[PDB]
Amino acid sequence: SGFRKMAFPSGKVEGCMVQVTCGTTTLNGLWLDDVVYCPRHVICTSEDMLNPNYEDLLIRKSNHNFLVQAGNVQLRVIGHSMQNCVLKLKVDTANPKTPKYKFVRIQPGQTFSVLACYNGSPSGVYQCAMRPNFTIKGSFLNGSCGSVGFNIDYDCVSFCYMHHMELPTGVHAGTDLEGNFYGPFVDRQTAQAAGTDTTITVNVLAWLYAAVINGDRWFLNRFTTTLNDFNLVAMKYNYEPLTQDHVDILGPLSAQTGIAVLDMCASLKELLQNGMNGRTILGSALLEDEFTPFDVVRQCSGVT
Amino acid sequence: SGFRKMAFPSGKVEGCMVQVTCGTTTLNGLWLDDVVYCPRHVICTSEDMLNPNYEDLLIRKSNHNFLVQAGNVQLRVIGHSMQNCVLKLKVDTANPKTPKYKFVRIQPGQTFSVLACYNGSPSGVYQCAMRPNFTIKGSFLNGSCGSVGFNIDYDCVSFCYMHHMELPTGVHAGTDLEGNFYGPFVDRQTAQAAGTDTTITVNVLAWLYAAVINGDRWFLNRFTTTLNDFNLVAMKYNYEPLTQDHVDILGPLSAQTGIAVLDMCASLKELLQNGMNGRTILGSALLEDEFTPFDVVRQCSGVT
Ligand SMILES: Cc1ccncc1NC(=O)CN(C)S(=O)(=O)c1cccc2cccnc12
Numbered sequence: 001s002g003f004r005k006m007a008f009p010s011g012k013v014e015g016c017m018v019q020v021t022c023g024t025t026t027l028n029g030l031w032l033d034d035v036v037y038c039p040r041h042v043i044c045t046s047e048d049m050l051n052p053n054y055e056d057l058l059i060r061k062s063n064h065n066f067l068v069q070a071g072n073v074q075l076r077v078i079g080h081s082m083q084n085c086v087l088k089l090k091v092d093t094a095n096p097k098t099p100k101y102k103f104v105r106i107q108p109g110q111t112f113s114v115l116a117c118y119n120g121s122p123s124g125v126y127q128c129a130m131r132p133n134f135t136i137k138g139s140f141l142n143g144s145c146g147s148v149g150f151n152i153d154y155d156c157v158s159f160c161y162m163h164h165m166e167l168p169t170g171v172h173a174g175t176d177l178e179g180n181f182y183g184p185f186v187d188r189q190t191a192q193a194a195g196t197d198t199t200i201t202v203n204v205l206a207w208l209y210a211a212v213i214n215g216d217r218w219f220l221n222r223f224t225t226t227l228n229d230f231n232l233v234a235m236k237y238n239y240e241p242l243t244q245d246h247v248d249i250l251g252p253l254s255a256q257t258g259i260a261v262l263d264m265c266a267s268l269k270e271l272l273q274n275g276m277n278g279r280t281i282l283g284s285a286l287l288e289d290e291f292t293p294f295d296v297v298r299q300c301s302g303v304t
Numbered sequence: 305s306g307f308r309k310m311a312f313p314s315g316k317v318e319g320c321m322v323q324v325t326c327g328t329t330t331l332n333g334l335w336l337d338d339v340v341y342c343p344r345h346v347i348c349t350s351e352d353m354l355n356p357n358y359e360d361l362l363i364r365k366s367n368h369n370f371l372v373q374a375g376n377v378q379l380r381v382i383g384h385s386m387q388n389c390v391l392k393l394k395v396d397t398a399n400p401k402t403p404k405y406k407f408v409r410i411q412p413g414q415t416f417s418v419l420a421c422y423n424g425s426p427s428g429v430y431q432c433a434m435r436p437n438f439t440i441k442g443s444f445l446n447g448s449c450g451s452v453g454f455n456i457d458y459d460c461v462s463f464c465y466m467h468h469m470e471l472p473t474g475v476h477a478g479t480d481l482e483g484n485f486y487g488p489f490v491d492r493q494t495a496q497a498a499g500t501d502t503t504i505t506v507n508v509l510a511w512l513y514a515a516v517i518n519g520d521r522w523f524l525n526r527f528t529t530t531l532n533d534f535n536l537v538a539m540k541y542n543y544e545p546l547t548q549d550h551v552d553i554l555g556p557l558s559a560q561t562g563i564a565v566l567d568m569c570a571s572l573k574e575l576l577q578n579g580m581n582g583r584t585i586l587g588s589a590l591l592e593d594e595f596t597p598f599d600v601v602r603q604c605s606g607v608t
């Protein structure tokens with residue numbers, strides 16, 4: 001029993017973190033096979049952050065200008081290329097600690113773990129979700145760029161995020177490992193305001209199922225609703241619309257608890273309309289939305 | 305910017321997790337040097353959980369009865385002994401991945417990371433605090449016993465907790481790595497009710513400092529208080545008494561933000577008396593107490 005915001009074990013990813021320096025800028029790189037992936041803004045000075053022409057800036061850079069250090073040993077850069085907003089630095093040595101891996105682009109509502117790093121060194125690990133406005137609410141300081149987000153399926157690490165920037169509102173933006181930003185964000189210091197940060201309805205329902213499994217049942221009511229009725233309330237509260245795909249995905253949780261998905265929707269509807277009344281659910285006074293139905297099943301079953 | 309509940313990178317601890325089986329019971333062990341540490345209840349059957357005589361039960365066990373598996377390879381047990389509530393299984397091979405380590409016994413209010421494991425395999429990592437009633441609010445299922453809590457200081461892992469049990473209220477109890485339980489708990493299935501789970505006042509204040517550093521300032525008021533006045537309110541709300549030692553420990557946060565500790569106490573006092581009014585602090589609708597002043601400085605400065 002107990003339900004915690006849990007990150008994947010980070011060891012497999014720690015074995016991939018390296019430091020990349022270009023001129024005066026130092027950030028993190030991800031070393032998989034003989035390639036080091038890092039944000040392309042490593043080539044920029046803070047003076048040219050307003051409107052960088054990455055292609056032009058890259059022309060002035062050679063392999064020897066990218067300093068890659070894995071622990072206290074230097075890696076030899078034998079090639080460099082830009083793919084969207086990431087640089088791929090080909091090194092002469094394959095990372096001996098390269099785990100089985102995939103590059104995936106996640107959808108909003110999907111959760112992942114972040115290994116926050118500075119100077120190629122891991123500082124901590126936390127669990128995130130890709131927000132519906134394509135930002136992440138992380139914990140990143142200057143030097144953390146190049147830190148990655150990932151999920152693990154037994155021994156295969158699926159890398160889904162690379163940290164690139166902080167927006168003026170303190171929220172974060174980044175790319176997948178092909179260098180494509182999530183959302184409309186760009187690696188420029190310019191007016192980039194995030195859209196509505198709506199609540200991930202399917203994740204809240206999964207977390208309400210976790211609460212029932214762990215003994216927190218006070219919010220369960222005598223009501224039911226329909227997808228259409230629920231969604232009228234969800235729109236009113238800036239919650240994402242719930243679809244039949246979401247209902248189906250909650251099927252195993254519904255089956256384990258014996259609580260129909262639409263009955264849990266009615267419980268959630270009453271929580272939205274009435275509030276918590278000073279009560280808590282799984283030690284929280286707000287409805288948590290950074291647990292997917294897959295995370296709930298995984299944590300409640302002990303998947304290793 | 306951003307402030308997250310962050311665990312230490314778990315790699316150094318993943319390299320220590322092993323599976324220990326004695327008869328029909330399987331749990332986790334911690335392999336450091338040529339010793340495997342695990343809860344002594346691995347020798348018990350669920351049938352004798354009410355009143356186990358560990359010394360007598362251990363007499364019927366020999367080295368070959370403890371099956372220790374590190375990955376998919378078996379370790380040879382050449383000795384076994386009981387130290388308080390842990391078994392120390394001497395193996396013939398020193399763990400080649402043994403990090404620099406210490407065994408520490410923490411005080412209530414101190415935080416640590418837990419690497420939840422099943423069958424010697426890591427499933428996830430989360431951050432905990434030793435509660436003032438000596439329980440932890442973890443996430444542990446059957447098979448998770450022997451999972452450890454730790455802190456990391458650069459390259460030295462300080463092991464502070466080993467999971468042993470779940471109380472009927474769904475809270476957790478365990479020992480330090482010398483096998484001494486935190487609090488009055490025993491490794492028996494008996495009436496063991498936890499005391500008052502008071503709030504760790506010094507940690508809440510540290511977290512209010514983190515909120516100010518990260519832009520959440522709405523709760524700052526025009527008031528101050530004294531330690532004695534604050535403590536009258538703290539007792540009323542089941543908050544731990546704040547001492548001059550706590551005030552001193554918050555000195556660096558006070559210095560960085562320019563907000564006197566007693567002024568932050570008055571802000572906290574008003575939050576206790578008035579509530580949040582539907583507002584949030586660092587994405588939370590309740591006052592978080594599982595960040596120490598050291599965790600706040602570490603996360604806000606990027607210690608690796
Ligand atoms: C500070 C911080 C905190 C947390 N997470 C990410 C960051 N960094 C950033 O957001 C990066 N910026 C300072 S930036 O202005 O977006 C930028 C754009 C383009 C080229 C650049 C070259 C060098 C430095 N910056 C550049």
Ligand SMILES: Cc1ccncc1NC(=O)CN(C)S(=O)(=O)c1cccc2cccnc12
Nearest residue numbers: 345348349350353444445446469470491493
């Ligand atoms: C189930 C669970 C979930 C989360 N975290 C810890 C647990 N286990 C427990 O609490 C362990 N118990 C089932 S127990 O009753 O306290 C116990 C005491 C003594 C000897 C025993 C031998 C074998 C199994 N149990 C024994």
